[PDB]
Scaffold this active site. Structure first.
Site, PDB file in Angstrom:
ATOM      1  CE  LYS A  17      -4.342  -1.724   1.893  1.00 37.43           C
ATOM      2  NZ  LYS A  17      -5.356  -1.583   2.973  1.00 37.43           N
TER       3      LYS A  17
ATOM      4  NE  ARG B 239      -7.447  -8.342   1.499  1.00 38.51           N
ATOM      5  CZ  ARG B 239      -7.130  -7.572   0.462  1.00 38.51           C
ATOM      6  NH1 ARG B 239      -6.194  -6.641   0.583  1.00 38.51           N
ATOM      7  NH2 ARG B 239      -7.757  -7.729  -0.696  1.00 38.51           N
TER       8      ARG B 239
END
Ligand SMILES: Cc1noc(NS(=O)(=O)c2ccc(NCc3cnc4nc(N)[nH]c(=O)c4n3)cc2)c1C
Ligand SMILES: Cc1noc(NS(=O)(=O)c2ccc(NCc3cnc4nc(N)[nH]c(=O)c4n3)cc2)c1C
Lengths: 252, 257
Positions: free
Chosen positions: B203, B237
């Site tokens: 991210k 995740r």
């Protein structure tokens, strides 16, 4: 919170610092490898002539040209991984910034030579059994810290390494990693070396070249516990991880 | 303790790695990737037919992407199957296919989503969320209030408290400073006594720091995973399972020491 200084150069210890390993076992390769690590974000380059015997002249022959060449080439902290007074002094002449000794200057004449240089020195714990792992290390550092100050080496010039993989089993190493924050009471910078060591290999069942991720994970855990300097083979990966760590810690 | 669905148990004494299985612009490739992640040591596979990063997706279209994969995996592998959906239709159909966990970034706020999720009896993960510049008076308080609100909604709807998972939602309505503030204070969210699921893989919170493309954000993502896991995050995740799993081994060994 603090910094360490040598030769008018300062090393910020408020953030985790990555020490690139430059073992010598060709001068051209050494200078180029150092260049690779420096661009990768290393703020220290560690030159080592022994892998944990070597002749004094042989060890000196390998070490001092690299130190001098780098001293001329780059404005970066230079560390020599040696246990020999001759190598200590000669490296000081060559422009070395830091003295890193796994044997804690216990070799003959080593302590006096190190003191004369005025350079910062790193003391490393070494021996497998322990009644209490952490207590033994604390007692060890206290003793040589007393010894180092006595020799005329200022306390604030000293660095402490708990010595991962040195006379320590698998459980001991991770016990040490878990309780690493405790060692801060000396109010001295902590240097750790876990890169590609058996403590990673035994867990992941992978060869040294595949221990990069495990080594970085250890480095992150250590750095989250306030470890100031990390001694690694893989500088770029460790530097990237330390960035995540520093952002996390600065975020309070 | 453990988390349970359809006779399967997820050990929460250890960090669990959830492999990301995006199914967007071949079933064969998906199965190979999932098996590969499974081989890498993932204990959960998250299947997503929608991009939360973006163009919308039709109900039938998302269903077409998700449910064959779920059905295919359910027969082939003994692994927790998680569906990354916000649609009641996709929720219900995936449950039929054998999905174990419902992962909704929108916290079952879409029409009929809450009711559909409740009927399945499957565990549900709630994720905090907020072109707008992210601001918080106090980030953690805002997150805590958010979780408290929607946990009640689920409990009122008939979804048992022990079926819930909380995700603070990294990169969702949060700037770079916010994300690492959240990572630093992540342990605080344990007070709900619910499992924590975190998604930081590749991210911008990694990218903005290292200024590298997503595929080169592996080390940064792993570093985040380690920090989160050291703070007791139960489920991670990630895109890169093998690296994360290896890191989790170091983490679990450290904590177990
Ligand atoms: C054979 C054989 N080779 O490695 C092992 N096992 S090992 O735990 O991984 C292992 C142990 C020690 C080392 N030494 C490497 C090394 C060198 N210099 C250092 N300087 C400082 N300041 N601190 C350090 O930690 C350090 N470590 C390298 C590997 C065996 C057994
Ligand atoms: C556009 C655009 N592309 O990337 C960004 N920046 S970003 O912080 O990296 C970013 C933000 C969100 C996502 N979504 C991906 C995603 C999907 N499902 C999730 N389910 C759970 N439970 N938890 C998650 O964290 C999660 N994250 C992916 C990337 C923007 C903005």
């Amino acid at each position: 919170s603090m910094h360490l200084t040598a030769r008018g150069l300062t090393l910020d210890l408020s953030r985790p610092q990555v020490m690139g390993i430059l073992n010598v076992t060709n001068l051209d390769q050494a200078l180029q490898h150092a260049q690779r690590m420096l661009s990768a974000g290393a703020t220290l380059i560690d030159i080592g002539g022994e892998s944990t015997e070597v002749s004094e002249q042989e060890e000196l022959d390998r070490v001092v040209p690299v130190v001098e060449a780098l001293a001329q080439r780059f404005d970066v902290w230079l560390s020599v991984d040696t246990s020999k007074a001759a190598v200590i002094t000669e490296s000081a002449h060559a422009g070395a910034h830091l003295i890193n000794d796994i044997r804690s200057l216990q070799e003959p004449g080593a302590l006096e030579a190190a003191a004369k240089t005025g350079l910062p020195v790193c003391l490393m714990h070494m021996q497998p059994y322990y009644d209490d792992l952490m207590t033994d290390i604390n007692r060890f550092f206290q003793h040589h810290i007393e010894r180092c100050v006595a020799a005329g080496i200022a306390k604030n010039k000293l660095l402490l390494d708990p010595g991962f993989g040195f006379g320590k089993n698998l459980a001991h190493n991770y016990q040490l990693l878990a309780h690493l924050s405790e060692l801060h009471h000396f109010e001295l910078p902590l240097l750790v070396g876990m890169s590609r060591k058996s403590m990673v290999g035994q867990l992941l069942n992978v060869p040294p070249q595949q221990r990069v991720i495990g080594s970085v994970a250890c480095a992150v855990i250590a750095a989250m516990q306030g470890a100031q300097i990390i001694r690694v083979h893989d500088v770029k990966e460790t530097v990237e991880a330390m960035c995540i760590v520093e952002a996390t810690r600065s975020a309070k």
